[PDB]
Amino acid sequence: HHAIYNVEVETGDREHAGTDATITIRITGAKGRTDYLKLDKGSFEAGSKEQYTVQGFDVGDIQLIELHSDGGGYWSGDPDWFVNRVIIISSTQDRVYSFPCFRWVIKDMVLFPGEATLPFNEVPAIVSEQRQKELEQRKLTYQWDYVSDDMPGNIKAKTHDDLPRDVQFTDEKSRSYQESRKAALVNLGIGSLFTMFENWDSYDDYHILYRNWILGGTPNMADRWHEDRWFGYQFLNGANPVILTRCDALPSNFPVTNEHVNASLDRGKNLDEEIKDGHIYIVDFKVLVGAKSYGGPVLEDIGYKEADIRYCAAPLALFYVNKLGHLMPIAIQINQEPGPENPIWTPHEENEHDWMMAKFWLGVAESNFHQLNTHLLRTHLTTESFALSTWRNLASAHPIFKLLQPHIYGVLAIDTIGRKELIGSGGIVDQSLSLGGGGHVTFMEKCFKEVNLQDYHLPNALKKRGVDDPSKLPGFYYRDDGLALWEAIETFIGEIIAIFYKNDDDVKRDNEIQSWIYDVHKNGWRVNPGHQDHGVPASFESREQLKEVLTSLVFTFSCQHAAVNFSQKDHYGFTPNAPAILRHPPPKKKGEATLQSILSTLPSKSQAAKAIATVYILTKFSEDERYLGNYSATAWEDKDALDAINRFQDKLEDISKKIKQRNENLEVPYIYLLPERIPNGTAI
Ligand SMILES: [Ca+2]
Ligand SMILES: [Ca+2]
Ligand SMILES: [Ca+2]
Ligand SMILES: [Cl-]
Ligand SMILES: [Cl-]
Ligand SMILES: [Fe+2]
C-alpha cells in the first residue's frame, strides 16, 4: 500500500521568489508519514506553477506537510524561495488538499491544509504541536526594542537586511525606495545649478522648485495658497486634517472678541452667536511649547526670549464657516501667552504682510506637528507595535493573522530603514524641519505620552472634535470619505470575525488573540512614568471589542496613513503653502512685516528644495503596490471568507465611484482616499 501523491507548487511572482535549491517534501497523515521526497525535475521560477508525482507510504488523510530546502549549492545566488501555495492529491484520498503559504522558505517550512483555525479548534495533536513550535520560534525571531522609555515598542533589527525576510521590503519596494533617493539627489543637484544665482525675491520664486520633479502634477494649492479660503480649506482637506475642533468657547489665553473678527462674519450674527451656532472652529498647537529647534532655540509660552537657527511656534487659530460654506481663518495668536508682544492677528491687519506672516507661523507649527505627530508617530511608529505583536503572537494558521498580513506589511521595513535615514542624526528631518537636530524625538516622546487607542477610532474621534456635522461644517472630504471607508472595513472585519468566532467565549478562549493584545498592552505602548493611559486593553472580552480594535488598526495602516502621507505633494510641493522651517523669531509688535523680512524668515531655497525632495521620497508608490482590498497575495481558503472578501471589494468599488462623482463637481478634487490610491499598508 503505497500512495501516489500529485504535488503542485505555486511560487510567488515577486523578484527573487524562485529558487535553485534542492527541494524535498515530507507528507504526514493519520497513518504515519513519508520520508522527504524529491521535487527535482525542472526549475522553480517566480510565478511558476510546477507539478511533481512522488510515491511513498500511504499516510491516509493528509494532515500537514514539510518542505525542506538544502539552501542551494556553491553557485546559488538566492536560494530563499517565496511559496504561494502547495496543492496535493493523494491516490488514496478523494480530496484536494490546499496548503496556503505566502511566506519565504529558508530551510524548513511546515504547512497545514484547509481553513484557518483558532488554537482551540479541534485538529490532530501533531498539528497543535507544530503550531506551538511556530509560535516559540516567532518569539525568538521577532523581538521588542525601544528608542526610549517614552516611545512605542519597535522591532529589534540593526538594519533592514537584519529583518526576517517575511517583513523586509520586496526587491521591487527596495528598488523604488533606493531609486527615489537617487532621483532626489539628481533633481536637487540640477535644481541647485539652475537656481544657483537667483535673487530670491518673491513668493513666486518658490514655484521653480517643484518644476523638475515628477510629482504627479503641479501642487494643487500652487495657484491659490495665498487666499484665506484655500488656507482654511486645508485644515479640512490637506495633509493634517486632524487637529481642528469645534469651538464652544474661546480659551482663556486666546482673547478673541467680536471686535477683532466682526469684519469676517457674514451670516448676520456676532462671534458669540456664531459660536453657539457651531460655525466657529479652532486649532491649538499647545503641545509644541518647550520644543527645541535646530540651532538651539527653545519655545516658551511667550514665544522666544548666518548660523542655521530655526524656529517654531505653539499658535492658536480661529476659523469661521462663512455663508458660502467656506472655512475661513479669522484670528491667529502665534504663541500661547497673550499680550502686546504676542497679539491677535486677523485678515484685517493694517499691514497686510503682518497677516501673511501670522499665517506662515501657523503653517510652521502645523508642518512640524503633522510630520512628527500625525504622520510618523501616529501612523508608522505606533502601529509598528501591533505589526510586531502580530508576528510574535498569532500563528500563520490563525484567521486574524491572515486578515492582518496584507495590512501590516511594510511598516517594520520602512521604520527600520527610517530609524537610520529619516529620524536619525543628519537625516531627512534634520535637513527639512525646524524641530530637526534632536528636538524632533523629544517632541514625539511628548506626543506619545498622550496617545490613546481611542484616537484611532475615526467616528469617535470626529465626534469628540465636534467636526462630524456636515450642516455646520460642510466641505470636509477627509471626514466623508474616511467614514465611508471606516464603515466598509468594519463590516468586512465583523463578517470575518463571525466566520471563525461563534460567540464571545470563542474570543476569551483564543489564547493567541489574548496574547496579541496583551503584548501590545504590556510591551508595546508602555504606560511609563509620566504617561497617560494608552487605551490598549489587556485582554479581549467580546467579538465587538475585537472588531473595534482591528478596524482601528486596519483603517490606520491603510486609509489614515494614505490621507496624511500621500496628500503631501499638494500640501508641501509649493513651499509658502506650508513652510516647515522658519529662520527668525516671531514679531513682538505689529507693523514690522515687509515682503523682504518675510522672505528672509521663510525657508531658504535649499531648505525648501530638501522639503520637496523629502516629500518626493515619502510619497512614491512602488510599482508592486497593492491597494485597499487587493488580497491577491493572501492565504485565505475558507469559502465564506472568500465571499466576505468579494462583498468588501464590491463595496470599495461603489465608494470609489461615489468619490469620483463627488470630485467631478469640486473645484479641487479630494483624491487621497480613493481605494485605488490607498495602499493596504504603511510602507513608505
Ligand atoms: Ca530566491
Ligand atoms: Ca516543471
Ligand atoms: Ca474573489
Ligand atoms: Cl515514504
Ligand atoms: Cl482560511
Ligand atoms: Fe509614511
Swiss-Prot record:
<feature type="binding site">
    <location>
        <position position="16"/>
    </location>
    <ligand>
        <name>Ca(2+) 1</name>
    </ligand>
</feature>
<keyword id="KW-0106">Calcium</keyword>
<dbReference type="GO" id="GO:0016020">
    <property type="term" value="C:membrane"/>
</dbReference>
<dbReference type="GO" id="GO:0031408">
    <property type="term" value="P:oxylipin biosynthetic process"/>
</dbReference>
<feature type="binding site">
    <location>
        <position position="561"/>
    </location>
    <ligand>
        <name>Fe cation</name>
    </ligand>
</feature>
<keyword id="KW-0444">Lipid biosynthesis</keyword>
<feature type="binding site">
    <location>
        <position position="380"/>
    </location>
    <ligand>
        <name>Fe cation</name>
    </ligand>
</feature>
<keyword id="KW-0925">Oxylipin biosynthesis</keyword>
<feature type="binding site">
    <location>
        <position position="80"/>
    </location>
    <ligand>
        <name>Ca(2+) 1</name>
    </ligand>
</feature>
<feature type="domain" description="PLAT">
    <location>
        <begin position="3"/>
        <end position="116"/>
    </location>
</feature>
<dbReference type="GO" id="GO:0034440">
    <property type="term" value="P:lipid oxidation"/>
</dbReference>
<comment type="similarity">
    <text>In the C-terminal section; belongs to the lipoxygenase family.</text>
</comment>
<feature type="binding site">
    <location>
        <position position="19"/>
    </location>
    <ligand>
        <name>Ca(2+) 2</name>
    </ligand>
</feature>
<feature type="binding site">
    <location>
        <position position="565"/>
    </location>
    <ligand>
        <name>Fe cation</name>
    </ligand>
</feature>
<feature type="domain" description="Lipoxygenase">
    <location>
        <begin position="117"/>
        <end position="684"/>
    </location>
</feature>
<feature type="binding site">
    <location>
        <position position="43"/>
    </location>
    <ligand>
        <name>Ca(2+) 2</name>
    </ligand>
</feature>
<feature type="binding site">
    <location>
        <position position="18"/>
    </location>
    <ligand>
        <name>Ca(2+) 1</name>
    </ligand>
</feature>
<comment type="function">
    <text>Bifunctional enzyme which is responsible for allene oxide biosynthesis via a two-step reaction; first the lipoxygenase reaction that converts polyunsaturated fatty acids such as arachidonate ((5Z,8Z,11Z,14Z)-eicosatetraenoate) into a (8R)-hydroperoxide intermediate ((8R)-hydroperoxy-(5Z,9E,11Z,14Z)-eicosatetraenoate) followed by the allene oxide synthase reaction that converts the hydroperoxide intermediate ((8R)-hydroperoxy-(5Z,9E,11Z,14Z)-eicosatetraenoate) into the allene oxide (8,9-epoxy-(5Z,9E,11Z,14Z)-eicosatetraenoate).</text>
</comment>
<keyword id="KW-0560">Oxidoreductase</keyword>
<dbReference type="GO" id="GO:0006633">
    <property type="term" value="P:fatty acid biosynthetic process"/>
</dbReference>
<dbReference type="GO" id="GO:0019369">
    <property type="term" value="P:arachidonate metabolic process"/>
</dbReference>
<keyword id="KW-0456">Lyase</keyword>
<dbReference type="GO" id="GO:0005737">
    <property type="term" value="C:cytoplasm"/>
</dbReference>
<dbReference type="GO" id="GO:0020037">
    <property type="term" value="F:heme binding"/>
</dbReference>
<keyword id="KW-0443">Lipid metabolism</keyword>
<keyword id="KW-0349">Heme</keyword>
<feature type="binding site">
    <location>
        <position position="684"/>
    </location>
    <ligand>
        <name>Fe cation</name>
    </ligand>
</feature>
<feature type="binding site">
    <location>
        <position position="45"/>
    </location>
    <ligand>
        <name>Ca(2+) 2</name>
    </ligand>
</feature>
<feature type="binding site">
    <location>
        <position position="20"/>
    </location>
    <ligand>
        <name>Ca(2+) 2</name>
    </ligand>
</feature>
<comment type="pathway">
    <text>Lipid metabolism; fatty acid metabolism.</text>
</comment>
<keyword id="KW-0223">Dioxygenase</keyword>
<dbReference type="GO" id="GO:0009978">
    <property type="term" value="F:allene oxide synthase activity"/>
</dbReference>
<keyword id="KW-0276">Fatty acid metabolism</keyword>
<protein>
    <recommendedName>
        <fullName>Allene oxide synthase-lipoxygenase protein</fullName>
        <ecNumber>4.2.1.-</ecNumber>
        <ecNumber>1.13.11.40</ecNumber>
    </recommendedName>
</protein>
<feature type="binding site">
    <location>
        <position position="78"/>
    </location>
    <ligand>
        <name>Ca(2+) 1</name>
    </ligand>
</feature>
<keyword id="KW-0963">Cytoplasm</keyword>
<comment type="pathway">
    <text>Lipid metabolism; arachidonate metabolism.</text>
</comment>
<feature type="region of interest" description="Arachidonate 8-lipoxygenase">
    <location>
        <begin position="3"/>
        <end position="684"/>
    </location>
</feature>
<dbReference type="GO" id="GO:0005506">
    <property type="term" value="F:iron ion binding"/>
</dbReference>
<dbReference type="GO" id="GO:0047677">
    <property type="term" value="F:arachidonate 8(R)-lipoxygenase activity"/>
</dbReference>
<feature type="binding site">
    <location>
        <position position="42"/>
    </location>
    <ligand>
        <name>Ca(2+) 2</name>
    </ligand>
</feature>
<keyword id="KW-0479">Metal-binding</keyword>
